[PDB]
């Protein structure tokens, strides 16, 4: 069984989900469908992943076959950077709602505390790093709170059940908590033994914000920007600390990395194209790491970040 | 001799100043007076330091003697944490103007991106960590931008020439730049070889924001406060890298530590607590560090932070 986490919004969120990043458009539907059959109920998507239409197909098929009801599926989407200007927030949320073929998303997160110049959905979707002027980055002067209030209105309109943020450092999250009416229910950040950010996790959890981790396998996880940084990093799967703990419990390094977060109340969203791993990625809660295990793993924290906007255009999010 | 820096506001600011933190009230006036006779023109103060009245006495004395005119002195003050609510900003500034005995302050910075619950000036001043409920910390929901607008108003009212922020991480400064009419002219942060944050510096400077470093001597300032972290840290004055470079140019480690910041366009406000130091700390621009030198000093960066709100009450400002 996959334990649930009660968000500050009152809604329940599965502690384990299926990452949808990089899911091929041609197979995304079938894969989400199979994941549902395998037991997954939460799917972590994003407008920027360009496959929400297909993720929706998979979900619709599971429902149409009577496998699950909409009420049983937890869908997470994220507002891309070009859509921070309040007047563009609803239009972006609608495109997401249509693509997924649903009336509301369970969780809608501000993907990045970065506001790109608006680009019409018809001109290019998803825009990625395109800002309307060739390969140049162009930003909009839209404070985070403006975008957040827009999201709050959308929750009142019944189009979103819970809202949160992603890739938000501590100072920024704090300032948002000051002007927010609906408190961020979730903070989704890169989280693994090489980037533990223990103080950020503790602050958030105490503030009642739930943590959703991504790139749980560190460099073993998928890395698109500065692939070199990840390739030149000693894998966690082969790290002696992880290897020893894994051997000790007769578990795979992957199970140890996912449990390391789960046992600490952090939600995970692994992604696998292999059916065997798919099942393992949701069946790892069969053991508990000890105090010593946690101490040994804690020594790995070196602040190594693989998803950094500083690589995009020297955006100071993490400095 | 002391180079000026033209701020984004159009006003000049001495690149070398006199720090007023932990400047005893009993002799603050005399010391400020002496600093002025020694050539200092910028004084970095703060409501929290609780010595602005004395600082004011020293400036007034120098003025009454005809040593300087108000316009030649550059006075920096900082809005303490209990006064972030817009309705209390001008109140706090008036207290500063009344103690300094001036019509305006040259620079007024948001001391910290932290908002303590308001405490009437008549109940306790300065409040320090007092938040109106015993030894408990209490906060108020006041977004940074709200405080910034109150300040922008005061600039238009002629009470402040330039405004800026202190202890702001990159993400927070970026967001502020999104909603600010008057761009923060200054970013004052802890800056020394053990905490270089080169990316924050680069971003700020490229954004036209002027950097003022504080605690240029690392742990020294905090050792004098009996802080465990600083006491356990090897001093920069006795560090092999600093001494080697100092010897190379026949300069003192102190001079190398200040030049290291000054050469990269960073303003310094060293705490001179001895006559000899008054002179030393304003006459270091007598040599240039080479690329090799910077690369050597660069190796000391280990992210060691001495002034951290996380120590007060786990405030996630730098996490
Ligand atoms: N908000 C954000 O900024 C952000 C950023 C990145 C990701 N995310 C989200 O979080 C999810 C996690 O990121 P991710 O997909 O890169 O990482 P991941 O789900 O941890 O998977 C990364 C890699 O590990 C392999 N893998 C998966 N399960 C495994 C297992 N049990 N044993 C061994 N290898 C295994 C996969 O290969 P195979 O598929 O071949 O098995 C894949 O190459 C994403 O799908 C996305 O939804 C959010
Ligand atoms: N905004 C903020 O959060 C913040 C925090 C701390 C300090 N500040 C400001 O910046 C100033 C400088 O920082 P600081 O006071 O913490 O430390 P500093 O690095 O300026 O000096 C610290 C100590 O080192 C010694 N020192 C000074 N000059 C020396 C020399 N030539 N040779 C040998 N030792 C020397 C003195 O004993 C002094 O107390 C403060 O006075 C204050 O105005 C601002």
DSSP per position, chain B = ---EEE-TTS-EEESB-EE-TT--HHHHHHHHHHHHHTT--EEE--GGGT-HHHHHHHHHHHHHTTS--GGG-EEEEEE-GGG-SHHHHHHHHHHHHHHHTSS-EEEEEE--S--BPP--TTT-SS-TT--SSTT---B----HHHHHHHHHHHHHTTSEEEEEEES--HHHHHHHHHH-SSPP-EEEEE-BTTB--HHHHHHHHHTTPEEEEE-TTTTHHHHTTT-HHHHTSPPSTT-HHHHHHHHHHT--HHHHHHHHHHTTT-EE-----SHHHHHHTT---SS---HHHHHHHHTT-----SS-THHHH--GGG-
d(CA B55, CA B88): 23
| Cα B236 → chain centroid | 20
Which residue owns the Cα nearest ligand 2 atom 39? Answer: B221
Q: Resolution of the deposited coordinates, in angstroms? A: 2.3
CATH number at residue A10: 3.20.20.100
Q: Which ligand is nearest the CA of B246, by number? A: 2
Question: B318 CB less than 6 Å from ligand 2?
Answer: no
Experimental determination technique: X-ray
Q: Select which of B33, B40, B49, B125 is catalytic.
A: B49
Question: A305 CB less than 6 Å from ligand 1?
Answer: no
Q: Select which of A33, A40, A49, A214 is catalytic.
A: A49
Which residues numbered 131-190 in B keep a CB inside 8 Å of some CB on A? 141-146, 168-175, 177-179
d(CA A259, CA A252): 11
- For residue B105, the cross-strand partners are B160
Question: A254 CB less than 6 Å from ligand 1?
Answer: yes
Nearest to B115 among A140, A173, A178 (CB): A178
For A233, the domain range is: 1-319
Which of B13, B17, B19 maximizes ligand 2 atoms within 8 Å of its Cβ, making it the mutation to test the pocket? B19
Cβ <8 Å between A141 and B197: no
Cβ <8 Å between B200 and A316: yes
Tokens of A51: 């496959």
Which residue owns the Cα nearest ligand 2 atom 13? Answer: B215
Nearest to B191 by CA among B181, B182, B204, B208: B204
d(CA A28, CA A75): 15
Q: Is B318 on the interface with A (CB under 8 A)?
A: yes
With CA atoms as reference, the chain B residue closest to A174 would be: B316
Residues of B with CB below 8 A from A145's CB? 143, 145
Neighbour-count burial of A302, counting CB atoms closer than 10 A to its CB (0-12 exposed, 13-18 middle, 19+ buried):
exposed
Distance A44 CA to ligand 1 centre (A): 11
Cβ <8 Å between A169 and B169: yes
Pairing verdict, β A12-14 and A4-6: antiparallel
Tokens of A313: 């255009």
| Cα A264 → chain centroid | 17
Nearest to B203 among A173, A200, A319 (CB): A319
Atom of ligand 2 lying closest to residue B45 CA: 43
Phi, psi (degrees; rounded to nearest 5) at A161: -85, -40
Cβ <8 Å between B203 and A145: no
Sign (positive or negative) of CA dihedral B292, B293, B299, B305: negative
Number of domains in chain B: 1
Number of C-beta neighbours around residue B153 at 10 A = 15
Look at the block and give the residue holding tokens 């306790």. B124
Nearest to B147 by CA among B85, B80, B58: B85
Pairing verdict, β B186-190 and B210-214: parallel
Q: CB neighbours of A97 closer than 8 A, spacing ≥ 6?
A: A103, A104, A105, A159
């Amino acid at each position: 069984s996959i334990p649930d986490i009660k968000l500050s919004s009152g809604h329940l969120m599965p502690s384990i989900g299926f990452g949808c990043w990089k899911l091929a458009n041609a197979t995304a539907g079938e894969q989400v469908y199979q994941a549902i059959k395998a037991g997954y109920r939460l799917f972590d998507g994003a407008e920027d992943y360009g496959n929400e239409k297909e993720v929706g197909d998979g979900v619709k098929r599971a429902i149409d076959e009577g496998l699950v009801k909409r009420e049983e599926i937890f869908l997470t989407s994220k507002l891309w950077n070009n859509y921070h200007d309040p007047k563009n927030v609803e239009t972006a949320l609608n495109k997401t709602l249509a693509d997924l073929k649903v009336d509301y998303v369970d969780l809608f997160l501000i993907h990045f505390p970065i506001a790109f110049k608006f680009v019409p959905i018809e001109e290019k979707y998803p825009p990625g790093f395109y800002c309307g002027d060739g390969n140049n980055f162009v930003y909009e002067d839209v404070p985070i709170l403006e975008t957040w209030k827009a999201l709050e209105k959308l929750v009142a309109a019944g189009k979103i059940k819970s809202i949160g943020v992603s890739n938000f450092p501590g100072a920024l999250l704090l300032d948002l908590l000051r002007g927010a009416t609906i408190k961020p229910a979730v903070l989704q950040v890169e989280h693994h033994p090489y980037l533990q950010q223990p103080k950020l996790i503790e602050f958030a959890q105490k503030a009642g914000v739930t943590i959703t981790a991504y790139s749980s396998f560190g460099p073993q996880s998928f890395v698109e920007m500065n692939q070199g940084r990840a390739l030149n990093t000693p894998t966690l799967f082969a790290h002696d600390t992880i290897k020893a703990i894994a051997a000790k419990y007769n578990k795979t390094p992957a199970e140890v990395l996912l449990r390391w977060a789960a046992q600490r109340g952090i939600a995970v969203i692994p992604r696998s194209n292999l059916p065997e791993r798919l099942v393992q990625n949701r069946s790892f809660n069969t053991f508990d790491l000890t105090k010593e295990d946690f101490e040994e793993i804690a020594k790995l924290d070196i602040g190594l970040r693989f998803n950094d906007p500083w690589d995009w255009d020297n955006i100071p999010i993490f400095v």
